[PDB]
Symmetry: none
Subunit: 219 residues, 8 copies
Amino acid sequence: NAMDIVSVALQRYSTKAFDPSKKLTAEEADKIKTLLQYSPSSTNSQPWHFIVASTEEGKARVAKSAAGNYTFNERKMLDASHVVVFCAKTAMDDAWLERVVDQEDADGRFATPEAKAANDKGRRFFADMHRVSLKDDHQWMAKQVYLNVGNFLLGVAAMGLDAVPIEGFDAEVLDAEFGLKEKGYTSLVVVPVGHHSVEDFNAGLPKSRLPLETTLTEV
Amino acid sequence: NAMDIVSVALQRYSTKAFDPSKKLTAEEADKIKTLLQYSPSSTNSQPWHFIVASTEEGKARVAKSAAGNYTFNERKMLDASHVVVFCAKTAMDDAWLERVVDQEDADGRFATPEAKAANDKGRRFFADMHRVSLKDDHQWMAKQVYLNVGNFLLGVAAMGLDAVPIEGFDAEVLDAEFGLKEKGYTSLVVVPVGHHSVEDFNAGLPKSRLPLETTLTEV
Amino acid sequence: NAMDIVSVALQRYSTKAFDPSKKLTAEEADKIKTLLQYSPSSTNSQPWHFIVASTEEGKARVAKSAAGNYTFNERKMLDASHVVVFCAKTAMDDAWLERVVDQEDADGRFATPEAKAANDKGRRFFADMHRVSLKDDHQWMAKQVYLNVGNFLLGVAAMGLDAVPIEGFDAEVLDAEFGLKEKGYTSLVVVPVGHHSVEDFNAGLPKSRLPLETTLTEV
Amino acid sequence: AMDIVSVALQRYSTKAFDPSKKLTAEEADKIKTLLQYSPSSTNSQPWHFIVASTEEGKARVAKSAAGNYTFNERKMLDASHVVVFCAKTAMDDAWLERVVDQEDADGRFATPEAKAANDKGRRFFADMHRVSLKDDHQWMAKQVYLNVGNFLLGVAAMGLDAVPIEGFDAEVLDAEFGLKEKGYTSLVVVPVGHHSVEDFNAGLPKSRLPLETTLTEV
Amino acid sequence: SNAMDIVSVALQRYSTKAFDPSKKLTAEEADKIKTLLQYSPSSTNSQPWHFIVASTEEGKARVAKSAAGNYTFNERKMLDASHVVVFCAKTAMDDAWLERVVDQEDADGRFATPEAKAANDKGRRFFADMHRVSLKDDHQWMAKQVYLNVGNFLLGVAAMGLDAVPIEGFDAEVLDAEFGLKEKGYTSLVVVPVGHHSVEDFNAGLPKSRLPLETTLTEV
Amino acid sequence: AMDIVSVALQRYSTKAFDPSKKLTAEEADKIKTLLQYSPSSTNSQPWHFIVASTEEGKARVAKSAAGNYTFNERKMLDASHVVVFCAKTAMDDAWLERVVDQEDADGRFATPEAKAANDKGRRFFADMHRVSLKDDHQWMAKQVYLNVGNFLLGVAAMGLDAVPIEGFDAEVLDAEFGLKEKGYTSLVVVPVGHHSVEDFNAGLPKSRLPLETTLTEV
Amino acid sequence: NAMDIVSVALQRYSTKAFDPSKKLTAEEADKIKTLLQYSPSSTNSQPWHFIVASTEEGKARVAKSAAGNYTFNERKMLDASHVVVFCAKTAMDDAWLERVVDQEDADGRFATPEAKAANDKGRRFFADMHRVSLKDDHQWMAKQVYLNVGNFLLGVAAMGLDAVPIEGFDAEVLDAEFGLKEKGYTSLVVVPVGHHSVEDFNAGLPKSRLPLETTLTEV
Amino acid sequence: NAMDIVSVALQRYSTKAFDPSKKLTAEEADKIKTLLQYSPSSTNSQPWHFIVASTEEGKARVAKSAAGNYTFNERKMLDASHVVVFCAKTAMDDAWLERVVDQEDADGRFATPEAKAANDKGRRFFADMHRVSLKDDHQWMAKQVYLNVGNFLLGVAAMGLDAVPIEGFDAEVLDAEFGLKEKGYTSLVVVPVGHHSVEDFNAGLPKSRLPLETTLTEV
Ligand SMILES: [Cl-]
Ligand SMILES: [Cl-]
Ligand SMILES: [Cl-]
Ligand SMILES: [Cl-]
Ligand SMILES: [Cl-]
Ligand SMILES: [Cl-]
Ligand SMILES: [Cl-]
Ligand SMILES: [Cl-]
Ligand SMILES: [Cl-]
Ligand SMILES: [Cl-]
Ligand SMILES: [Cl-]
Ligand SMILES: [Cl-]
Ligand code: NA
Ligand code: NA
Ligand code: NA
Ligand code: NA
């Protein structure tokens, strides 16, 4: 019980081994989903999908993505209580842009149709800038997914849970395993969540970061 | 909020109108820098730099990146107490990889020479996959920065501060203003941090997100 | 008249006599009520009441206020088509403050209860400042009434109507005749509206104003 | 023929101004014309205006946006032109003589008696206020608000955005422009220009109490 | 200038129900109202009275404390008026006060001889003893003199263009305590806020009402 | 010229009246108006007045000046008009009704409810005296003195001379006019007229205790 | 009560207000009449008459003389116990001279016929000087009356009574009211006699007389 | 207080012969001066002067006025102890009117300048009425002198002294001998005072006065 978020930031770490017997409570499982849902994103475009594998059969399917050049990650994926796959939309399409603004409307953010149209115009200006002008909407959406991941990592830490972000996995394999390409998504980061085991000596190591003198300019 | 982080996630929003007379305390200024510094990143590569503008002359320089299409963002850059520019490295050089491992060593993460070397090899395994195999290191590093942004936005919300993530600025202009190109960095996101004014009306709107039924698959 | 309003400002004048046979159309009569209603006021507190006299009997009641020392204004009050009495609330009571914000809420200006509450709070702060700290709530509310008068005079001119503000009337008499003080109001300005009589030469006298060299400072 | 009612139904208080949108030279001349040609009791014109259009000028006015009112600073800096409305602090004889002489020079009086009669007629009213009621200061401040009401509807009709600000420190503002010594005090600040795409209020319906409450027809 | 039209003033004054706290008395009006309190006549010129004039915010607040309890409806009138007057009567007609009054009349030069002064004293003491010894009446007798003063005061301040209201609805015990009156030998009787009515006072515009002379007056 | 403090400082108790100087018909009406329009608690008006102006009249009043108050006879006889101030002996319901009904007839009540409330308001105070304190007799008496005070100042302001007399036999006066049965009792006699050149109190200076003693300022 | 006539002279004064309830005793009433009777006068000529009013009806008749300028003297005459009017004869007639000497003869003052006739002649010596030579008997008699008044004022003062000599009355009115002209008299001074009222102003004032250095010469 | 003054009135008589060996004591001589001084007079105007002869030379000067036709009075004037000449003013001058009121003021009879001024007005009224309206101010003043005489004769009788009022002298001679005319006085009555001689048989004669039936009307 605190408001001490910096203590959380200084105490969390990348979990290198989970205790396969320590599970998220029902409520914690609810919270982590809420964290995924409520992350911010450019223009609130929410260009993403999440898979939460919580069953042995589920994590097993996710785990298959580690099979080739990534076997050293398999254990982490199988031992954690919950395993989240962060996926990005493969394209930013009119239908999604409409869905977003229509949801904002249903949530009651526009007092007039003029306000709604101004919101929609603003969003579409940005999105067109990426798909049409810059042709970088793929990496634009991926960046939003990573923003979500940063949010999530701190969020689960604050809940007392352990996690580790994994980029080492065959995305082509994982995508196919869940039919993501057909559905319009591509997997980007996998985050197993649970509690560390006693074999995780990373839990007892000092945190390390480059000094502000290097990474920070005050102006 | 090292506990009830979900309430924080439900209560935060993008501020548009900052009160320019409500500064961060010296304690808070230090904490935000700590959040920047302690963000996770793939292999703890920390491929980033931050500019924190807190003086009027400093904020005005950042604000120049908001000319043209982004004039509406200028006020938030000017009136917020502190303005953070998130920058990514332009290329993952060997020297940066050496610097990260040497720092992990100074901080006491490796009880022996071989533990260090193992860590180094393991980091370069990933670095080379991006630098050599995929040729996507620029994007790879920019995603680390967004993870940082995500971590930051939640952190500052937990500290009771108001913020907004701004993509609406001219990165070219900003880079030139701070000589980032020659320094090896490029700006990606600007985040004004401070306290909202009584006129920041986004504070009176409910949050809107897509339902889980759409964005979440449980297995 | 939307657009060439300056010409309108330079055509209008303070009518000295009205043609008693020229009446506002039913449409014009609505317009003028809209003008009264939709005037701005500090915090939209709308601290006012209007009597619009349009019948022989109604006008004669208002004209009583012109019966002693102000008989030079009696004819304007009797011959004009519609005579409007502008009245200030005699106190900014809690009920009114509540009435105002409930109306804004009904009109859809508040997305959340937090928004309604913040608007209520802010308005109450200002009201209390005038009643309690400054003890100038009467002058404050009378000023909003005069703001309304200004808006009104220009407004009816743009409609092609003649009008004149009258301060030469007995407000004690006029109040008593309508029971204004017991209702929590008091009369401030009377404004006859209609069309000027052929005898009113002033309709084509040159406008006279102090030069800007005297009254305006540009910086 | 207007359509002035639509102007009244479409206008609102702009809270955020686009700092890059300026009045045209012609628009800027017209707002001064509006200020100047506003009505006032006996045409006493008991006022002074400051119009700030430079960044130095608006910054000076903006000092008054301090303490509880810092939230108003940004309006005053971003808007194209910021108008400060000021009332005279006392109705002096010299001003009453100035007005009537200006009317005379403008040819409002066919004869010397017309001038004299106008002068006495104004003094009848002036004296009610400064001798009998001793409220001349409040009386003049009211004329200034009349002007403000005139102005707000004027600029809306020109297609310009605005907002009337009472949340500023009049003492600071008066001192910054040395108004007390000059015989004036500031009352309302009206930033004028074009609203930002992010102006919240432009996205909100207007709200007024219904006529059933505020209007009595007889 | 014009003759004093006092009846005109009687016909215009009224009991003010709402005061404007922005409209203060002038400093000359302040001194004059105190002269009115002083120069009121009284039986035998016995001046059995004390006056509290509250002009400050702290001052009016102390007085307004008397309006708590069953008289909260009088509190606002006591806070909003420029000046508030508390009329108090003496608790006893003591020899000391009799002596004080007769000596003041001497110092003011009303007596040409000791024989004039002594007769004046004897006359006053007769009346006083009749009330305090014989009739057992003195408190009421003195209270009447204070009410006479109030009547003089109400008409007076009206003539000066001021608004006032006589208030009997207040807690005398409390008011006395607040000012340690019992000890000083006085008790509070009437409170009179003085100043100017606000536009909230609709009573200022109401016709005056009085029973017709045909009921209250016998000519003979 | 209306300066009422000047009146206060100039008025005094007249001991000797000029029997040849009468009030004008208009002054007689005016003093009646003063009696009538005096203020009183809740406007309860708990009083009756006898105005003796004939030789026969004043003499009937003068009878109350006997025994110890023989020196007051001449004042009552020599004055133009002699006012006897009387209080009700009891505040009865019928009088309370009469007052409120009169206020109603005079148009002081916008609604039947306003009238009812005025009634309750008065009875709130009446009952505090009638039922609780049991001091209504004295309460009304005090209203009469208020009237006396108002009257003394008024007639002085009219330029008339007067004196408040308590030195008379009230029982005798009451019996002479049948007051007890009518429901009243006499409290104060005030002769009104003009002083004779042998009214020497007119040559004495006024004397009051100093404010230093009688006034607390806060 | 021992005789101290100078005390009486120093204590007496003109009473202005009489107590109407204080009467002379029957004995005092005889005594004041004895005073009037036994006053000296030149040659014992006694050229006088006295009205003594003791009834309300009586004094009212005398008080009529106090009108116009002298109405202020009415209350004295009405309030006093006894009011005395001193009247002088209007001519010295032979019948009166005869009456006086016959009275002296009846009272036993003359031892011989010569004595009586000598006294008669001697009185006429003086009487004729006045009514024949100087032609001033009117004044001469009126002087005797004033002599009587001086005797009287001091006498009643010695009796413990208060009084005042009134010249302020209309003699013509008083004369007519009593049919004095026809009777051969005229009124000169009125002296109310009785007891002062507690409100007699003059009773509390010091006597004032000019100093002897001014009024007296010693040789 | 209640002294037996009537007895004095009934015992006094007009001395016909004085005992030249009997003198007033110094105290008696002070007293009679007081009697002269303290006499009342109309408006206290005190229109008089007194010469008191008590020496052989002084009495002889007064006695010159008895030469010629009045030698029958010579012995009284020479044999008495003190001889008082009563003189009236020849004119009531503003100067005297002023002296009187100023003396009343010095004696402290006036509480305020208002009182003094009224008294001075009242007196001047009366004075003017005599000197101007009636033209009888000589007689008016002479009457006051007689009043004084009457008061004196009873006064001195009460002191146990003998006296006699004398009119039979030559006032022209008496005036001349004391330069009275230039001083503004004229002599009116001479009153020798002392003790009668054994030879004055008149001391024991019955007193004679007309009956009240003739001289007094009671109403
Ligand atoms: Cl679950
Ligand atoms: Cl944010
Ligand atoms: Cl105009
Ligand atoms: Cl000018
Ligand atoms: Cl000027
Ligand atoms: Cl609105
Ligand atoms: Cl609004
Ligand atoms: Cl409506
Ligand atoms: Cl009395
Ligand atoms: Cl005869
Ligand atoms: Cl007289
Ligand atoms: Cl004789
Ligand atoms: Na500029
Ligand atoms: Na719009
Ligand atoms: Na009547
Ligand atoms: Na006769």
